[PDB]
Swiss-Prot record, chain B:
<comment type="subunit">
    <text>Component of the GINS complex which is a heterotetramer of SLD5, PSF1, PSF2 and PSF3. Interacts with PSF2.</text>
</comment>
<dbReference type="GO" id="GO:0000727">
    <property type="term" value="P:double-strand break repair via break-induced replication"/>
</dbReference>
<dbReference type="GO" id="GO:0006261">
    <property type="term" value="P:DNA-templated DNA replication"/>
</dbReference>
<dbReference type="Pfam" id="PF05916">
    <property type="entry name" value="Sld5"/>
</dbReference>
<protein>
    <recommendedName>
        <fullName>DNA replication complex GINS protein PSF1</fullName>
    </recommendedName>
</protein>
From Swiss-Prot, chain C:
<comment type="subunit">
    <text>DNA polymerase epsilon is a heterotetramer consisting of POL2, DPB2, DPB3 and DPB4.</text>
</comment>
<comment type="similarity">
    <text>Belongs to the DNA polymerase epsilon subunit B family.</text>
</comment>
<comment type="function">
    <text>As accessory component of the DNA polymerase epsilon complex participates in chromosomal DNA replication. It is required during synthesis of the leading and lagging DNA strands at the replication fork and binds at/or near replication origins and moves along DNA with the replication fork. It has 3'-5' proofreading exonuclease activity that correct errors arising during DNA replication. It is also involved in DNA synthesis during DNA repair.</text>
</comment>
<protein>
    <recommendedName>
        <fullName>DNA polymerase epsilon subunit B</fullName>
    </recommendedName>
</protein>
Swiss-Prot record, chain D:
<dbReference type="InterPro" id="IPR038437">
    <property type="entry name" value="GINS_Psf3_sf"/>
</dbReference>
<dbReference type="GO" id="GO:0043596">
    <property type="term" value="C:nuclear replication fork"/>
</dbReference>
<comment type="function">
    <text>Functions as part of the GINS complex which plays an essential role in the initiation of DNA replication by binding to DNA replication origins and facilitating the assembly of the DNA replication machinery.</text>
</comment>
<comment type="subunit">
    <text>Component of the GINS complex which is a heterotetramer of SLD5, PSF1, PSF2 and PSF3.</text>
</comment>
<dbReference type="GO" id="GO:0006261">
    <property type="term" value="P:DNA-templated DNA replication"/>
</dbReference>
UniProtKB/Swiss-Prot annotation, chain E:
<comment type="similarity">
    <text>Belongs to the GINS4/SLD5 family.</text>
</comment>
<comment type="subunit">
    <text>Component of the GINS complex which is a heterotetramer composed of SLD5, PSF1, PSF2 and PSF3. Interacts with PSF2.</text>
</comment>
<keyword id="KW-0235">DNA replication</keyword>
<dbReference type="GO" id="GO:0000727">
    <property type="term" value="P:double-strand break repair via break-induced replication"/>
</dbReference>
<dbReference type="GO" id="GO:0005634">
    <property type="term" value="C:nucleus"/>
</dbReference>
Amino acid sequence: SLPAHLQQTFSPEEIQFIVENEPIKIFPRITTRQKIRHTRWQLITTDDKALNNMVAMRSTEVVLWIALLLKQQSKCSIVAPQWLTTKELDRKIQYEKTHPDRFSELPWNWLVLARILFNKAKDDFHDPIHELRGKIQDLREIRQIKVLKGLKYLNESHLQLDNLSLLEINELRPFITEIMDKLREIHTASLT
Amino acid sequence: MYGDLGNKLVLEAKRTKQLYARSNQDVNLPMYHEDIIRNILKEVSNLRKNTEYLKEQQQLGMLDDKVAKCQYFVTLLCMERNKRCLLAYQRLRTDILDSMAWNNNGLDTNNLSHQEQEYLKEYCDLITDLKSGDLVDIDLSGSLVPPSDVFIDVRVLKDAGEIQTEYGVFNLIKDSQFFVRQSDVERLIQQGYLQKI
Amino acid sequence: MFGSGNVLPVKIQPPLLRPLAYRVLSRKYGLSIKSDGLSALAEFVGTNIGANWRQGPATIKFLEQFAAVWKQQERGLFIDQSGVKEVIQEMKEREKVEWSHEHPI
Amino acid sequence: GYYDIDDVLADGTEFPCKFQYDIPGLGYLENNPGRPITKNTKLSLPLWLARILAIVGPVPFVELLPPDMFSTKVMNAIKTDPVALDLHSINSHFFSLAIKWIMLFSEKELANVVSELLLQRAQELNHHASSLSITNIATSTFLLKLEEMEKEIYKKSHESYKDTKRWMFKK
Amino acid sequence: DINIDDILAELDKEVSPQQDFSDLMKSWKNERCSPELLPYPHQLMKRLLNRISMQSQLIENISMGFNESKLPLLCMETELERLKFVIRSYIRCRLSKIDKFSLYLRQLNEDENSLISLTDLLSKDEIKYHDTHSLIWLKLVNDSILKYMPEELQAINDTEGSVNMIDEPDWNKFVFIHVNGPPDGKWNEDPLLQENEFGKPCYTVTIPDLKEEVELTIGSIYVMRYEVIRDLLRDDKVALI
């Protein structure tokens, strides 16, 4: 029933769905607030109290599919997180270049959220998009170098990483799982 | 040895797996190899004759102290290898027929056998029985892609007349554009009469 | 044949059959409905039921049987008015056999 | 696994072996019609016979000789340069046969050799799978030197990388 | 100085659908990467079908009720189809893993000594699917292959063959796991939790085929065998990434 390319791993659009199902800070451009003198929102998979209390030009916290849906309307503009600034990305780049053995303390959804906000929020960034995408590509490349260095330690027992992103888990999942499964199969056949 | 014909059958089993791996859209299946399985059935009939002959020779009991075990095991492994080849090819065709039923018919009769035709038909009745009763609000044969875009632009490929939807009536004039929800026309995208994003 | 309907037939329309068309067989069983087939289905549901077509479960069960029968023949992914006529005649034969099964006569 | 077709072709390969007993009536192993097998006969048989013919038999019926695929020349060639070795010309399913030989004859040195070989060609497999053209000779000659399970792993990794490339890079 | 955190904390104090949905994707992400067919959360899925039915009648009643603020209706609509997608993908994945392990499941039903049954493991629709799929595959291989083979070799639940007839799940399949600690925020009630060097606690588990003890510090991701992590996943301490 399940397709062969969705058998033992997630597709990247399922990762997009998973990271669309998080809260995010946002600026409404419409007023749905009841004054002292309109059907309610009434959702069942997220808290609708922050969406019922939606005030124009304020900071609220809504789920990301609502964020993208309202950005398509341009009724509400998505605010980038703290780590999507040039200074914080430069700090992450310096941490990557400082400790070669350890990955930086980036969020798990740092590639997928960046792609979503680049392709959907082209006028919602205080810093320019240009150097932001340059630093995103630099962090992606240095994380690729670190996972290429760490792949020399493919052990039969176990293998650990600290702060690898979910999209990088789907980058490296079938290769690592198949190679370690066959290494374990070789050693378990080697046991008496 | 004797089971090399089954190995030849399993070669086209590997060939149709490599056909399925490179064809993302469900192509027509290769024709059912009737002649090779007829040869394997003649082989297993000859193996039945051989094991009955060695049973009656063990009843006669000439030169059958320790030898008859050895060709008993050789004939048993030959039938086991033939069963392995036949069941591997049959289960590969079974799995690709299950995928074909789940993909397109849920949401070309020359190549299948009559037993494969009734397998596909009764599996179609099973998968249309699954979405009835319980699990009815969802569709089990529906799209496995997430609905990350609630509204899409849709272009009409072929002229399919006037159709209905949930609360409105759609047209299928050839080469026209709709700005409609993905779930309203998702089945029609699966039929291929509509195709965009 | 069919079960007896007490009230007289009425000519119900493809409007107000819209929620009772796409959800019951086109999503549960996956069969697209054309306009002429929907009109023939509306006419036959009207003649079978009468004024209780809005709240009648027999309409929903008959449409489930329609989708099931169209699934055994698989005469088309669409629904044709002539196809509705053939399925209706085969259903008349089918429930004639079922009535002979109910009372052996 | 029963239904693994790659395992079915792995069992279809023939191994050299020696007959330990004088067994009449099995002349169809060496394509003869009716020759009884003499004592200490060297013959190639498929693995689905000789895997448990060496078990049942004390002295078993069939002794499994060391084949050319596990010889000291092949072991030394693997130990020298694991990347550019052409494993396809040796055997198309060398690794599954290696796993079955290790499970049958518990050899620790062969286990270390095949594990080290799998690690070194897995590095090069990952290097060729992560490369997406916007095909080179240096990658396709290595695809010419790959096994069926290894090109299966490469196909899984390469379609994974290509699908996430088209997801990240366009809608 | 005076530490005031306990008195201020105790002065500060002077089933839910969102948690159900988070548990639903916890089950979905644990199901997709696992080789073993996970136990069915019957109460959670019954509550989810009841909730999706009440939302279906709610959105149809508001459609009968149709200022024009259609954005809450659009929120209802994409709410319904995204929930339907999650439920559809979870049931489709577990149905595929039912189809992979049909012979294992029918032996597990046939073995009365084993405590695992399909009433504790599968839904009624999944039990029906597995049963009638086993019969249709059985009938196909009897009128295809096994009619022409003798009485020893028509068995499909065979064990004593040269190669094993019955499929078996990869109990030691390597999987990505991320530790969450206990499901609750209160850490001291877990007996398996123990404090280590550098402040960070860990879970200690033993691989038996190598006979080694390994430490899984809270807040880091690993790849481990599934037999090692099965008892932690059944107690819901990790998440299968």
